[PDB]
Symmetry: D2
Subunit: 251 residues, 4 copies
């Protein structure tokens, strides 16, 4: 209760799964939220499922769309006032090794997972700095930003990039007294409707050689660390990686 | 409010500084707390300053005292019921390089910072496992568990040890379905009365080449990440390192 | 002497600085080498300065040029036989924070430092696998793949990407018994003619708060770790990061 | 050939396995070597198997024996002249979780793996500094200094300690211009006669979920990285971790 009072958050890919849970908990803690997603059908439903338009709205946007980022920030401020909090959560995966990744696949994934995060972080710093907002940028950077996976080559590239680019941004903001923190969150495997739609995926993810807890997480596991990072409770945390993975990376 | 309802926590070195702030926020969130420290004068005052004996008590103990750990767990359970949460926060520092560390200094520091954490973690697992408590062991492992400092040789050894020993414990608990999580917290420099008593220390800690934010933290910065880790909000986090350092390790 | 007997290496950006030193030591250890660079004037001079055409040749290529990679591998094999070793060393830097990076700057840097490394790694795996060559791909991934720098935002992104993408590739090659290893090398600051051309740069790099050794490295420092990684001496090393930085990242 | 000309090395636990291979390659590269071990029977045989007494000798010593360290350095200097190189390789393992580790087991393992490395590093700095030797201390710090293992609790503690204590020492030596480098080497699983004596161990170590290469290493894999680190080739490497693990930590 009240942990995000006054905050105004953008959550990319906020209409499903992890992003939707982050949105839900943000609203519960007093934030106003603009969620984005590619599909209006899904997105309007999602916003209404969380709260009323005075609490949460949807904005249709592909995070790779540089011009759309400007429109997104403007729409959010029009609805809720100046943005304090950005969660760069939108992302896609290609299930290919580096060897077998086509250049089109490479470019498509990087456009969302790397360029999109860059566009959001860059614009967020510019729009959120020097306003006394306790501003916070939270970049979703995966266990695949720490360890490789033989069949996630491009995804690994994107997540390693987000991990270290976020430190750069954190440092510049800190050094310049911008009142903007930047941190990364690194989920392990999380149960969502999309995982449920892939037969055997959860079971394979839950083997002890993968996730030592013997089961996978759930979207609220990621929501709660994001509440901490968005809140003023984490005012001394910047440039750091927050891993919530069931032990995946500990072995 | 209510984030630690029902929890029963031991916080070593809980009478001062970081430990005291962790205790204060734990009580505010509904936990019952036993704080430890070496000095009864300080410790009884500290407990009363936070709350009444039904909320928080003091137990005099040096964390290097193996036999005392058993007495501490027994006293805490007698007061509050079964322990769910342990914060291994007690620690000391020697301001010597490896080269200049005497063997007595080495042994003294390791007894508190390494043996003490081992004793607490080992006993905590045994006493807290398999009780449906949502048990959590939080080990204080420092930015000096990630980077070296030329004048903190023994301290660095102890903090690196705690960092990786905690992963071992996390994994065993996960694999055995013990319902015990183990994580480490890594503060950067934090302002306390002890720092205030060392002329020039805060200023040197606050130079941008040390802490990019240009100032040091405060005890509640560490309290809030500990609330998260003690709570069931972090039920999928185990074997991980949580850094709150003002950017120190990001550069 | 003889540590790279029989090896055939491509070194991108091999006409200057670090790349040139890697080429020089590779030839001294018995490898045949194709160096690349953008400028024929510089590149032909460089090759001849190291050895004769039976030892080392130049191929003009921008590592962002996907089609040129195919031509480079074909030219190298025509000259020297099947390629065993690839050093993805070509890279550029933009001296901008994330906030101040233009999209053109972002795309330009990623094209060389990320796409180029992807193109080389992908093609290298395909061309070098399953030939009994003891093949090795060495990706230059910087101290800026571990820590952020407030004025190297895009560079940090690229180096973090290379760091983790290389692990993916390493794992797939290992799991598939391809006889290809992939590792990253992370130089700290190294003295080159280009550094000498920036007044004050070496001095600033040599301050103890930057490089604890109080001076910067020299190109052969990076050459020697690359000899190790190219050689069969390192046949059990894959997916790892090799840092040669004067202590930069240790504090 | 000649890569360690003039060097004088102490290798603890040099009579078997990894240590013996390091000794063998050191002698081949021109170093004079004193190997240590607990058992004279084994140690004298081992030294003679590598070379003549003008190249390599044995000194009986338990690395936990603080007073014996002084005698070891004196004996080595008497035989070969001033010591330039120390490899802290002696170590033991206890196959217990943190939960199940007895205090006696804890103390025994730490005495060898942590105190012994401290004693050697401390004395090495004192004896090797400021002599123009290109001195190098190489501390064996394991993949178990990066990741936990549920049944290696005390071992993990010791290896994490060595990892970060070595950075402290590296930094102090660098900052004080001591001409001493300190680095850590982190083997994955390596085939030795002792591994061969444990039925099924190699096979379990070689499963892809453990070592992605599908086989384990051999002692010379660790010898060759130690040659690099002992040599002047690595004069800009200090405070760093060198992992040779078949991909174990990359996933
Ligand atoms: N859940 C897991 O099993 C798991 C495990 C490891 C890492 N992760 C990472 O964690 C992040 C969040 O996961 P999730 O569960 O929310 O994802 P999800 O349930 O798998 O659904 C995919 C998400 O990606 C977003 N997205 C993809 N392309 C987009 C685009 N062009 N523009 C805007 N949004 C786009 C979608 O946003 P919209 O629905 O709003 O259109 C959607 O929410 C992901 O980026 C993923 O890489 C997830
Ligand atoms: N605050 C900082 O500037 C800073 C920076 C980096 C890391 N840290 C680490 O964070 C941890 C918490 O810091 P802090 O601010 O609470 O410490 P502090 O204000 O500096 O005071 C020292 C603390 O160490 C505890 N302690 C030392 N020996 C003990 C023993 N034998 N038995 C029980 N307790 C013992 C004391 O416990 P009692 O008072 O209860 O007797 C006391 O709370 C420390 O372990 C420290 O290593 C602190
Ligand atoms: N030296 C340092 O101070 C330092 C410090 C940290 C990291 N690094 C990294 O280490 C790597 C090697 O450094 P260095 O000293 O060799 O570089 P350098 O002396 O600074 O010269 C720049 C190099 O980048 C290469 N390059 C840039 N764009 C290229 C392109 N489009 N196609 C082919 N080559 C291109 C050039 O190759 P050609 O000359 O052949 O055209 C040239 O060798 C660099 O990638 C750099 O990011 C260097
Ligand atoms: N080989 C592996 O499967 C493996 C895997 C991961 C990590 N490691 C680590 O790598 C290091 C080297 O392995 P290794 O193969 O040489 O060991 P090993 O073949 O398993 O034999 C044990 C070694 O430990 C040394 N040792 C134990 N206690 C000692 C003491 N009190 N004083 C002096 N030496 C002592 C012995 O030295 P002496 O024989 O001279 O008496 C012996 O060489 C070890 O410390 C180990 O922790 C090994
Ligand atoms: C971990 C991850 O990003 C992923 C993506 C698609 C399918 C399975 C896993
Ligand atoms: C960082 C730390 O532990 C310390 C301890 C004593 C004095 C100054 C710093
Ligand atoms: C470290 C690095 O890449 C760099 C590049 C250009 C100028 C100064 C440093
Ligand atoms: C990895 C390691 O140290 C070990 C020790 C004893 C038995 C098996 C493994
Ligand atoms: Mg792993
Ligand atoms: Mg640093």
């Amino acid at each position: 209760s009240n942990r995000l009072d006054g905050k105004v958050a953008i959550i990319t890919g906020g209409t499903l799964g992890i992003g939707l849970a982050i949105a839900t908990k943000f609203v519960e803690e007093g934030a106003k939220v603009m969620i984005t997603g590619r599909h209006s059908d899904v997105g309007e439903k999602a916003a209404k499922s969380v709260g009323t338009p005075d609490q949460i709205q949807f904005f249709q946007h592909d995070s790779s769309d540089e011009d759309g980022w400007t429109k997104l920030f403007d729409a959010t401020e029009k609805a809720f006032g100046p943005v304090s909090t950005l969660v760069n959560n939108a992302g896609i995966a290609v299930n290919k090794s580096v060897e077998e990744t086509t250049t089109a696949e490479w470019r498509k994934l990087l456009a969302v997972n790397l360029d999109g995060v860059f566009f959001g972080t860059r614009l967020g710093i510019q729009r959120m700095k020097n306003k006394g907002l306790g501003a916070s940028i939270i970049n979703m950077s995966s266990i695949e930003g720490f360890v490789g996976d033989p069949s996630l080559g491009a995804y690994n590239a994107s997540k390693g990039a987000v991990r270290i680019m976020s430190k750069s941004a954190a440092l510049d903001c800190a050094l310049k007294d911008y009142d903007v923190r930047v941190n990364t969150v690194h989920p392990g495997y999380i149960k969502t409707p999309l995982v449920d739609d892939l037969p055997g995926a959860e079971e394979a993810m839950s083997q002890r050689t993968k996730t030592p807890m013997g089961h996978i997480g759930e979207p609220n596991d990621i929501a709660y660390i994001c509440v901490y990072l968005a809140s003023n409770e984490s005012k001394f945390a910047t440039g750091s990686e927050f891993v919530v993975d069931g032990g995946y990376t500990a072995q």
